[PDB]
Design a binder for this molecule. Structure first.
Ligand code: 3N3
Ligand code: 3N3
Ligand code: ZOL
Ligand code: ZOL
Ligand code: MG
Ligand code: MG
Ligand code: MG
Ligand code: MG
Ligand code: MG
Ligand code: MG
Lengths: 343, 343
C-alpha cells in the first residue's frame, strides 16, 4: 500500500525529468528538433504503465533511509533514480517489441508500429538509455553512491541483454525444436532477461542511496529478488496467452514467436506422445488456427490451474526466503514488493 | 605513419579482448550460448575495418604519455580503451545499417542482413555497447581516470544518438522536402552524428589516460577535432556515391534514403530552377533509374571537382586550427590523424 501513497509525487516528477532532459537544448539550439523527438519518445514510452519498478526505488528509499535524512533534495534524487529505472525499462521494451513482433503495449500501439516511426525506434531506444546516465550525472554526480549507481545500471543492462540473447537464441523463427525448451534453460533465461532489472535493480539502487553497499547485504537481497523475478516472468508468460487483454494492455505473441515460455515448458513435461506431436506441428507459426490449437492443448492439460497452484507455492517459497534473507533490511521492503506482484 | 607501427600489437590484442569478455561464462555456464553469440557478434562486427579510431587512442597515448610511464600494463589498458572505441563504433554501425537499409559494410553483408540474424541484431548492438563498460571496469577500475572514461564514452554515445536522431528526422522516408537540406542543418547533423565519437572521443580518451583532464585543454582539442570530423563526414557522403565500391566496402544508400548529404546540399546551392525540379522528382526513391538521374545531375554540376577543392581548402583550414590550438599537445597527434583522413 506504500506504493499508492508515493505514486503521485513520483509521477509528478516526470514533468521535471522531461524539463531537465530538454534543457540541454537551450544551450544547443541546433539540436532542438532532436530534443523535441526525445520528448515525444519519452512521453510515449515512459508514460502509460504502472511505474512499479521506479516506485520500488522510492518506496525502498523511504524505508531504508532514516527520516532525518529524507530531505527535499534526497527525495528528489530518489524520484530521479526511480525514473532512471523506468527509462531502462522503456529502452528494453521498445527494442523487445520490435524483436518480438509485438502489436500493442500499455494499451497503445507499439512505438515502432506507429506510422512514421518504424526502425528509427532503434535509435529512440538508444536515446532513452542515454538519458539514464544524463540524469544520474545531473542529480547524483556529487553523491558518494554515484559510481555505484552508474555501474549498477550498466551491469543490469548487460545482464538483461545476455538474457534477451538467450531468449532470442532459444526461439529461432520458423525453426521449431521443442527439445530446447527445458526447465533449466527457462530458469536461466528469465533470471537474466527479467529478474535483474525488474527486481534486483530497483532495490539495489535504493540500498546504494541508503549507503548500504556491502557485498553480503546485496547478495542476500538478490537471493530474494531473483526468485521473485522468476515468478514474475512466469506470470508474464501465463498472461501472454491467458491474461485479460483489457488488463495486460498487450497482445501475446509467445506461441507465434516460438518462445521458451513457462507454458510450453509445462506442456512438454505433461504432454503425451500424441499431444507432443500436436504441439510440434502448431508451435512457432503465425497461423491463428495453429496458435488456437496450442492454446486448446494447454487448456486440456489444465495449465491455468497449474499456474494458480504454482503461484501459491511460489508465494510461500518467496516468503520463506524473506524470513531467511531480509535481515538486516526491513521485511516490509520485500513484503510490499511481493504484495504488488502476487495478485 | 605511427599508425602502421602500432596496428599489429593493437589488432593482436583483440584475441585477449574476446577472451576476457568470454571468460564471464566460466563462472556462469548457463549463459554459455549467449556468450557464444557475443563472440560471433564481436568477430563479425568488430573485425574487418581499418581500426583507425581505436588506433588513434593508442597512437595518442604513446605521444602524450611519457615513455617511463608506458609500462606493459599501461599499454594493455591503452589497447583496451582503443578497442572500446571500436566497439562503440560497431554498436552504432550495426544499428545504423538497419536504419539506413544498407546492404554491405567492410566488404561483407551487413550483420542484420545475414540469414538468421535479422532484427535480433538490435540486441546484438546493445551487447556490444555493454562490452565497452565491462572492459573499462575490468582493465581501468583502479585508474584515476576511470570515471572520466566512463562519462566520456556515455556522453559521446548520447551526442552520437542526438546526431542520428537529426540525421533520421531530416530524412523522412517517402517524404521529399529539399527545403530542409540546408548547410546549417548539415553541419549540426555531422557534428553530432560523427565528429564527437570518431574524432574527439579517441583523442579525449588518450588525454584522460595521460592525466590531461583540464577543461581548457579538452576544449582546444575539440576545436580541431570537431572540424576534422565535419570534413570526414563530408568525405563519407561524397564516397557514398562517387567512391570506389571495392575500396569503401559498402553500398551507398544516401539518395534512396532521402538523406541530407553534403552532395544534395551542394546540389541545391548550385541548381537552376529546372535542375532543382529534377532533383525533387528523383530524390528519396528506390528506383535505380531515379537514383541514376540524381547522380547525373551531380556530375553535371561538377560536384566531384567541388569536393576535391573543398578537401584542399578544408585541409588548409584544419592545419591552421592546429597551429592555433594544438599547444600544449604535440602537433604530431593531430597531424598523424589528419594524414590518415586526407588521402
Ligand atoms: O500491472 C502491471 O503493469 C505489471 C503487469 C503485472 C501482472 C501481474 C502482477 C503485476 C504486474 N505488474 C506490475 O507492475 O507489478 C508490480 C511490479 C513491481 C516491481 C517490479 C515489477 C512489477
Ligand atoms: O579507410 C577507412 O576504413 C575509413 C574510410 C575512409 C575514407 C577516407 C579517408 C579515411 C577513411 N577511413 C579511416 O579510417 O580513416 C582514418 C580515421 C582515423 C580516425 C577516425 C576516423 C577515420
Ligand atoms: O515476454 P517478454 O520477455 O518479451 C516481456 O516480459 C518483456 N521483457 C523483456 C525482458 N524482460 C521482459 P513482454 O511480455 O512485456 O514483451
Ligand atoms: O552515412 P552514415 O552517417 O550512415 C555513416 O557514415 C555511419 N555513421 C553514423 C554516424 N556516423 C556515421 P555510413 O556511411 O558508414 O553508414
Ligand atoms: Mg516481448
Ligand atoms: Mg521478449
Ligand atoms: Mg511476455
Ligand atoms: Mg549508414
Ligand atoms: Mg546513417
Ligand atoms: Mg555514409
Amino acid at each position: 500500500d506504500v506504493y499508492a501513497q508515493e505514486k503521485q509525487d513520483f509521477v509528478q516528477h516526470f514533468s521535471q525529468i522531461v524539463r531537465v532532459l530538454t534543457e540541454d537544448e537551450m544551450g544547443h539550439p541546433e539540436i532542438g528538433d532532436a530534443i523535441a523527438r526525445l520528448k515525444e519518445v519519452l512521453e510515449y514510452n515512459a508514460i502509460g504503465g504502472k511505474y512499479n519498478r521506479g516506485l520500488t526505488v522510492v518506496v525502498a528509499f523511504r524505508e531504508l533511509v532514516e527520516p532525518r535524512k529524507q530531505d527535499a533534495d534526497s527525495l528528489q534524487r530518489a524520484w530521479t533514480v526511480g525514473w532512471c529505472v523506468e527509462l531502462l525499462q522503456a529502452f528494453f521494451l521498445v527494442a523487445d517489441d520490435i524483436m518480438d513482433s509485438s502489436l500493442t503495449r500499455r494499451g497503445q500501439i507499439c512505438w515502432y508500429q506507429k506510422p512514421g516511426v518504424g526502425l528509427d525506434a532503434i535509435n529512440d531506444a538508444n536515446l532513452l538509455e542515454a538519458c539514464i546516465y544524463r540524469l544520474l550525472k545531473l542529480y547524483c554526480r556529487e553523491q558518494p553512491y554515484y559510481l555505484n549507481l552508474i555501474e549498477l545500471f550498466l551491469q543490469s543492462s548487460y545482464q538483461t541483454e545476455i538474457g534477451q540473447t538467450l531468449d532470442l537464441l532459444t526461439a529461432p523463427q520458423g525453426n521449431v525444436d521443442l527439445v530446447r525448451f527445458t526447465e533449466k534453460r527457462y530458469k536461466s533465461i528469465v533470471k537474466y532477461k527479467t529478474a535483474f532489472y525488474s527486481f534486483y535493480l530497483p532495490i539495489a539502487a535504493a540500498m546504494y542511496m541508503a549507503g548500504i553497499d556491502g557485498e553480503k547485504e546485496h547478495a542476500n537481497a538478490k537471493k530474494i529478488l531473483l526468485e521473485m523475478g522468476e515468478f514474475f516472468q512466469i506470470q508474464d508468460d501465463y498472461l501472454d496467452l491467458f491474461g485479460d487483454p483489457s488488463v495486460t494492455g498487450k497482445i501475446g505473441t509467445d506461441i507465434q514467436d516460438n518462445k521458451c515460455s513457462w507454458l510450453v515448458v509445462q506442456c512438454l513435461q505433461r504432454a503425451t506422445p500424441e499431444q507432443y506431436q500436436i504441439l510440434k506441428e502448431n508451435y512457432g507459426q503465425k497461423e491463428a488456427e495453429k496458435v488456437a490449437r496450442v492454446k486448446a492443448l494447454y487448456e486440456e492439460l489444465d495449465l491455468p490451474a497449474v499456474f494458480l497452484q504454482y503461484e501459491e507455492d511460489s508465494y510461500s517459497h518467496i516468503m520463506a526466503l524473506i524470513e531467511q534473507y531480509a535481515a538486516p533490511l526491513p521485511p516490509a521492503v520485500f513484503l510490499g514488493l511481493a504484495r504488488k506482484i502476487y495478485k
